[PDB]
Design a protein around this ligand. Sequence first.
Ligand SMILES: Nc1ncnc2c1ncn2[C@@H]1O[C@H](COP(=O)(O)OC(=O)[C@@H](N)Cc2c[nH]c3ccccc23)[C@@H](O)[C@H]1O
Ligand SMILES: NC(=O)c1cccc2cn(-c3ccc([C@@H]4CCCNC4)cc3)nc12
Lengths: 323, 333
Amino acid sequence: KPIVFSGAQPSELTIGNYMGALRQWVNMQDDYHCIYCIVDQHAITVRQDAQKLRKATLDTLALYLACGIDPEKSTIFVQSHVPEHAQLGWALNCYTYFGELSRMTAENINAGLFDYPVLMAADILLYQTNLVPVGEDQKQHLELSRDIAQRFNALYGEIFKVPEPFIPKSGARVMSLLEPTKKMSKSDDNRNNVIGLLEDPKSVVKKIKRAVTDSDEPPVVRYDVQNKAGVSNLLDILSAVTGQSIPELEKQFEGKMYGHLKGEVADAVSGMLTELQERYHRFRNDEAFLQQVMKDGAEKASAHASRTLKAVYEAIGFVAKRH
Amino acid sequence: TKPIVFSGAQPSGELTIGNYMGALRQWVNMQDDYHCIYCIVDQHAITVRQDAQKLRKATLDTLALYLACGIDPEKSTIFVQSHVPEHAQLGWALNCYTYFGELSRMTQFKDKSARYAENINAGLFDYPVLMAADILLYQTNLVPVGEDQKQHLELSRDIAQRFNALYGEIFKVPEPFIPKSGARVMSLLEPTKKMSKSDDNRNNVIGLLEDPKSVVKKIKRAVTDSDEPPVVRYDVQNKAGVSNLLDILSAVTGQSIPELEKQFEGKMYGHLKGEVADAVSGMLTELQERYHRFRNDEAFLQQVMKDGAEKASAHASRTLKAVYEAIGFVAKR
Ligand SMILES: Nc1ncnc2c1ncn2[C@@H]1O[C@H](COP(=O)(O)OC(=O)[C@@H](N)Cc2c[nH]c3ccccc23)[C@@H](O)[C@H]1O
Ligand SMILES: NC(=O)c1cccc2cn(-c3ccc([C@@H]4CCCNC4)cc3)nc12
């Protein structure tokens, strides 16, 4: 099976993240050898509270498990638990141009923020990764990892796989509630633009009722991204939850106002989130379960990572460690 | 417990009398007085592009040379840097508490970048952070180095203090131990330039594993000055070559420069060079005699690397545990 590497930040998922990327990938765990790395060494490139970082790491783990990531099928682990990432990160620094890092898309910036694309390259290249499902803002980073891999391979032979981006997209388009032109993003400042995965039904109703629509008279529930962006987003959200087609929903809401739509959207979304939240809290509060998932995952990751790093170290010419 | 000494040298190029006087001499002298840990920094070496066979051989050459100088594996911890993962682990973590401007301003990065314009790599830029990690892992009190590493060591103090201010008494703040003589041995044909272990012009350098007869010839041809009459006196500005020779002689014999100046009263550069050649040739003969006994004994070198990496890992893992707990990582099971 092809190896898929996905990096997960320990810092709050939305329905866009879930119904888009994550739900798609939960259903492909038997098609691919999927690896999920909670990237706590990348997280510290921004200064943050220590106790919140620890909490956020475990929050992220439980939520990925809640979404359906199966630790017996896929490998899920915490980045800092596998030393090989930092080890390969340093080695690949020596085969990465300073220019390449400076050209990524002043003197008080920390070196971690400057140097993390190399660590990212190491994260991917450690596991002989075939595919990486990056977003558009990390396409440049993946490309650097491909360039590093080909450069190293040209000097020393075929040590690394040249990874590819995962090209086909989720299916669910999920846009911001007060800005339906812009995509719903976990990193949005405006909280009223997003529905978080742990939001309660009262919070969901409030945010959906405030969601922007249009001034059509009569109000008409019809799909039109150009002219009716807000109503179209509500339709896409509802379709993504229920599996009902757009033309089916258009018929279902014939002669109905935007209030009825919003009510059904809120009910559908919160119906979905109640099942995920049940799973989330059950997993998250079970310390022994989470510890065993992390230990098992780190063990699997380390077995593969050590194999690659040993070949890298042999190629460079380092004297092999005496065990 | 004793205060801790940490220092390192690269298995790249060929170690010189400069590397010896600035660093290795002090390493040997500190072994009983302090708890000493000495590293072959192969991960730093590859910031300049190395042939793979040369790197491996040079790592083992350097190890054997530590032993030849008098570094005793019963007294000191001797290990190869890449054998202890914690160096790279703390190296990454400390990037996040190091500013970009602190690294771009470094003299060594600037010198090496001008020299290797075809390979100005991220490792060469990030060099000081990994070096800080090397030191800070072992709760280091003293770092014996030459003058050229003072800037790097100052940053490691800054990183230690900056991290400690946020998180508590995680690191010791290390101090430089730079010698009075031989802290910056200069090139024989260009005494305003530091002696390099990778000089294109071999006549500039006195190599630790070089034929003593070849070394004597190079000392004889070392540039001096046009002073009339020739006078053996210390003056770095106007008599760089003579001063450098006096410095080398002071560091080998343990005699002060004022003492040497008095000794060479009424003498000229023939006496100076004769005395420098005698002392250095004697030193290298003894050193190289010991070197081959160690270097050709693979079982012994293998055992030193095994025991050393074990000792180092015990200390390094303890520090990294505390660093990881402080910054807020979920602790490994
Ligand atoms: N011409 C000279 N005269 C006097 N001393 C000199 C001369 N040239 C070099 N030195 C000193 O030799 C030591 C090793 O130098 P390296 O370039 O191998 O290697 C270096 O310059 C270090 N970055 C290696 C290192 C890596 N991590 C560390 C942690 C602590 C101490 C040292 C290290 C150094 O002490 C250096 O000051
Ligand atoms: N997104 C990925 O699939 C991925 C795979 C492998 C390594 C990765 C590292 N990242 C990543 C690295 C850094 C960041 C940000 C960069 C800006 C500061 N805060 C953290 C976000 C994501 N993403 C990775």
